[PDB]
Structures are given as structure tokens and as C-alpha cells.
């Protein structure tokens, strides 16, 4: 397969793949291969995009070196190395955020980056972190040291005290930020309850339940208007909830990818579309009706295009 990583960009319109020979960048909806820059030897385990520009953040095989790659110039322009392993990298026009197993470091997007802030987190081997790219919102959210709590920080007005949200009681397994940067979704390791909070307040906007059996949550994502939300769990299972109606606690739709491989989920071009990128190189598009039933159903192998 060669697939080591897959992740959506900030508008979920594109998704990039880290491969053992290099990286690939795809268009989410419709599916199309935009770029495949092989010959990058090392094995890319994390790719971060800054919308549809030319800069990509790549984490090598050793996971100790963050490399910014200018696809226009076809070369590495910035290289930040770390003594510990890099778990994730988040990008924005003026800041480069690097996720470590114990802390979050914010650098500048200059030729020689300048570490601006250091935030402490709990043990974060998943690399949980979200960063609003919107120009009017430089919000950064990461697991706090309090097991189950989320800490929010405005990267612009850093002097303001952070926001400690007592989200869950166990170890956090997934976090998600809406496109507008105003609402955040949380999930514990039990994976039975999903909670959405306000990033500017810190109150439970809505709590949703996916099932009774404990499952490990993989990916969570809002839509544009933050009215719907899709949650992926084990065996490629995706639940689609409604977020702006307290009269709904369950998911109005639920599907499974044909291969049953775990996947990441995000909404597509059509307002009733949900895209699922599975670990086995599978692409799955799901169209639902207002009641939740399936209408169309597209499946393909994106790594073979």
C-alpha cells in the first residue's frame, strides 16, 4: 500500500498522503490526483497543508525533523529539527505549530523560524492539536495537562488567560475545530459521548451519543455552517449527527466503508455528502437524504490513480 498518513487540509477540499517514497496531494471532491512528489527518501509520516498554496509541512521517517517544502521550487525551504519525536505539525500564514509528545511550540514562518510560545500538554502520542487558519482567528487548541481537559489559546492576544474546558474525564482521543473557528468538538477514549463547546466561552453547546459499546474515535469534522458533524470510529464506521438541535442525541445516519478499514471523515462539495479516506487506500463518498438514508455511493482506490 505504502500509505503512512492521510489528512485533510483546513477547508477539507484537499487531502494529502504521506508515503514511503514521498507524498501525494489529492482533491477531496471530486477525487483527483493533484501532485505526487516521489524521490523524497525517508518516509513521510505527516503532511500538513496551508490551503491550496505551495508550502507543505513534512515530517520525515525519523520523526525528529520538520521540513517545509516549496512545491513550486521543488525543494525544502525550512528545516526545524527536534531532539524528541514530532507527532504533528499545524500551519498558518504567520505561524508554524509543532506538536511534540509533551509540549506545543509555536514558531514563525520565516527562513529561520523564531520560537514564539511554548505550551504544555499531557502525554499526547496521537498529536492532538487544532489551529484555526482564518485570518480573523488565530486560535490554538491542545490537550491540557488535566486528563480530559482542553486548553484554548489565542495565538494573537496571548496575554489573555487560556480557557480550560473540562471536556471529558478520561484521556482525549480526538479534537476538531469548525471552519469558522468558533466551535470545538471533543471525544474521550471511551468514544461513547461527543461534546461540542464554544471556543470563545467554554460551555457545552451540545452533547451527542454514537453508541453504547466503547469504541476508539478516529476523526471528527464539522460542515461549513457547523450544523452537521461526522465522526469516524473503528472498522470504518462513520456516524453523521446534527449539531444545532438539542432534540437530537443520536446520529441520523451511519454507514461503513466497504473494506471496513478505519478512515477519516469530512463533508464534501454537495451539502449532503460525506467523504471517507481509509487507511487501505480506499476513497468512499456517501450521499444521504434528510432522513439519513443512502442515495448515491461512490467507491474508488485513490492510490491507483
Amino acid at each position: 500500500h505504502g500509505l503512512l498518513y492521510a489528512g485533510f487540509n483546513q477547508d477539507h477540499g484537499c487531502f494529502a498522503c504521506g508515503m514511503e517514497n514521498g507524498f501525494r496531494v489529492y482533491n477531496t471532491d471530486p477525487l483527483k490526483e493533484k501532485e505526487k512528489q516521489e524521490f523524497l527518501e525517508g518516509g513521510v509520516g505527516h503532511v500538513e497543508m496551508l490551503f491550496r498554496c505551495n508550502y507543505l509541512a513534512l515530517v520525515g521517517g525519523g520523526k525528529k525533523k520538520v521540513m517545509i517544502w516549496d512545491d513550486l521550487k521543488k525543494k525544502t525551504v525550512i528545516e526545524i529539527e527536534f531532539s524528541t519525536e514530532v507527532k504533528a505539525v499545524k500551519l498558518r500564514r504567520d505561524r508554524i505549530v509543532v506538536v511534540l509528545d509533551s509540549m506545543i511550540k509555536v514558531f514563525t514562518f520565516t527562513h529561520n523560524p523564531h520560537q514564539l510560545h511554548v505550551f504544555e500538554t499531557c502525554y499526547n502520542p496521537k498529536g492532538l492539536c487544532v489551529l484555526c487558519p482564518n485570518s480573523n482567528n488565530s486560535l490554538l487548541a491542545f490537550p491540557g495537562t488535566h486528563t480530559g481537559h482542553v486548553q484554548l489559546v489565542d495565538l494573537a492576544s496571548t496575554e489573555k488567560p487560556p480557557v480550560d474546558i473540562p471536556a471529558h474525564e478520561g484521556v482525549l482521543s480526538c479534537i476538531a475545530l469548525n471552519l469558522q473557528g468558533t466551535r470545538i468538538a471533543t471525544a474521550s477514549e471511551k468514544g461513547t459521548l461527543i461534546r461540542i463547546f464554544d471556543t470563545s466561552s467554554g460551555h457545552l453547546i451540545q452533547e451527542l451519543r454514537r453508541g453504547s459499546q466503547a469504541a476508539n474515535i478516529y476523526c471528527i469534522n464539522f460542515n461549513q455552517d457547523a450544523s452537521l458533524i461526522c465522526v469516524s470510529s473503528d472498522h470504518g464506521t462513520v456516524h453523521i449527527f446534527a449539531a444545532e438541535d438539542p432534540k437530537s442525541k443520536w446520529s441520523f445516519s451511519k454507514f461503513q466503508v466497504p473494506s471496513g478499514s478505519p478512515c477519516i471523515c469530512a463533508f464534501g462539495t454537495e451539502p449532503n455528502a460525506v467523504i471517507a479516506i481509509c487507511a487501505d487506500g480506499s476513497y468512499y463518498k456517501f450521499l444521504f437524504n434528510p432522513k439519513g438514508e443512502c442515495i448515491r455511493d461512490v467507491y474508488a482506490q485513490f492510490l491507483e490513480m
Binding site: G13, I68, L72, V77, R93, D94, T110
Partner: peptide
Amino acid sequence: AHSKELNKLPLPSKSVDWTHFG
């Protein structure tokens, strides 16, 4: 002074193509 500003600006502000992938 212009070159001084450039080397002290974010790389997306200097060399970028926000439609490189679309």
C-alpha cells in the same frame, strides 16, 4: 529597507501561489 522587510516577513507573504493546488 525593502529587502530588510522581506527577510523579516513570513515566507507565504514573500513567495506563494495560493492556487498552486487549485
